[PDB]
Design a binder for this molecule. Structure first.
Ligand code: CL
Ligand code: MG
Ligand code: MG
Lengths: 265, 254
């Protein structure tokens, strides 16, 4: 009785399942761009509050946004408000907190897990933990928490055991997200891949070839979704990855975006 | 160090490391309920008890930051040597008991005040309110004189733009010395022992507290808005009583 007629997909480029060379150019108005922030567009700093955002970063993101007609999103472990504080690009689509909050292209923001009483109980136990361990840093991120040990590397074991134990106490609602010198605790059932897939179901992203660039373990789910959709996954820096392409550094990734922009306009 | 709040909304934490936290509280509408007139406020004895307990447990890193003057705060709190920034920062008693004033007795303020006293004497309904080092030109009871009030106030501020700023309000134009606001008072405290180096908490209820929220946030701390309204504060509580309940729990956890 009913059919499922589709329009020919706007994507004009497909990447196969193999390692790939980063293209010289991309048809910017048929491509969707998803970027992690720390360690990807901006260098990782000794603490989250110490990152330095060069002026090139907002200029390049905004030019990509213009030339692609809005199909650029930040998909970060930071909160949306933090990303807004550093780029000040009004109305930029942002998935923050590994997908626990997302602002779509209309500017509507959805959040999950904020004000959850269990997070406050987890937070209180981690606060006591970092009290006993100088050099560890507890970062409170709205609906998520980050247990940093970059300045106490000898405490990686106690950070892991504490975070794994608290997550297990609330395993129905929370999940662990390891990262470089950090363990983050975040609501269950949201991730960077799901956030990318949600963007790709909405204008202006829908039907376009996706690009995803990231540097850490959380980003592998973004690479997975970009690959499943025939797109281009770019790992920044060293490490095993499912990304199809790799660049050495934040500067080298930045340089790729700059070339795509120049080739476009 | 140890505890950082990100730029995001935030829940009120169940506890805080009191010996490593700095606390800054607005007074009216934040620690005590709003009143129709300034002297009609009632300060329950809970307020000085909770403030003093936090002062002891944090080893001195508690300050009041209010538009009220220091002497008024002392009259209601009776807490000896409590650090207090009064009159929006125009007077500030530090942790050593020394009071620093900005613009008090300035010859220029008295000249501005004399010009405005001439203006208000001609135009009934207008009222000149004198607030130590700052002035307020009211026209609530003479609303048809708003343009006269605006031109005169702007002209006088312009004659001393080096040192005075104009701030419009509801049926009023405020003339304040430069560098006088709650954010600057917070910032000054955080450059002094025992506040220096500590994660700040700042609680407030209206627009004059927004700069205090911004300073707490810049330092990775906890800004708390009392009541409804748009704010830059990261956390929110429903009421004066609700905020007091948070302080009470933080103390009891200590
Ligand atoms: Cl993820
Ligand atoms: Mg990253
Ligand atoms: Mg107030």
């Amino acid at each position: 009785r009913t059919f499922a007629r589709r329009a020919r997909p706007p994507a004009a480029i497909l990447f196969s399942e193999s390692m790939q060379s980063i293209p010289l150019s991309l048809p910017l108005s048929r491509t969707a761009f998803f970027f992690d922030f720390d360690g990807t567009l901006v260098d990782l700093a000794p603490t989250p509050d110490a990152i330095q955002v060069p002026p090139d970063v907002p200029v390049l993101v905004d030019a990509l946004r213009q030339l692609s007609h809005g199909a650029v999103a930040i998909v970060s472990g930071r909160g949306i408000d933090s990303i807004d504080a550093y780029l000040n690009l009004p109305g930029l689509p942002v998935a923050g907190l590994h997908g626990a909050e997302r602002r779509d292209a209309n500017g509507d923001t959805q959040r999950i897990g904020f004000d959850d009483p269990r997070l406050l109980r987890i937070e209180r136990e981690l606060a006591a933990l970092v009290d006993r361990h100088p050099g560890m840093l507890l970062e409170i991120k709205g609906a998520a928490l980050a247990l940093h040990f970059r300045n106490a590397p000898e405490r990686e074991g106690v950070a892991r055991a504490a975070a794994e134990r608290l997550v297990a106490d609330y395993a129905d609602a929370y999940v662990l997200q390891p990262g470089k010198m950090v363990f983050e605790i975040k609501p269950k059932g949201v991730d960077k891949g799901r956030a990318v897939a949600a963007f790709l179901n909405e204008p202006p992203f829908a039907g376009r070839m996706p690009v995803f660039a990231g540097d850490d373990l959380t980003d592998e789910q973004g690479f997975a979704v970009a690959n499943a959709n025939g797109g281009l996954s770019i790992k920044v820096g060293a490490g095993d990855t499912t990304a199809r392409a790799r660049v050495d550094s934040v500067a080298a990734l930045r340089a790729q975006l700059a070339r795509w922009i120049a080739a476009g306009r």
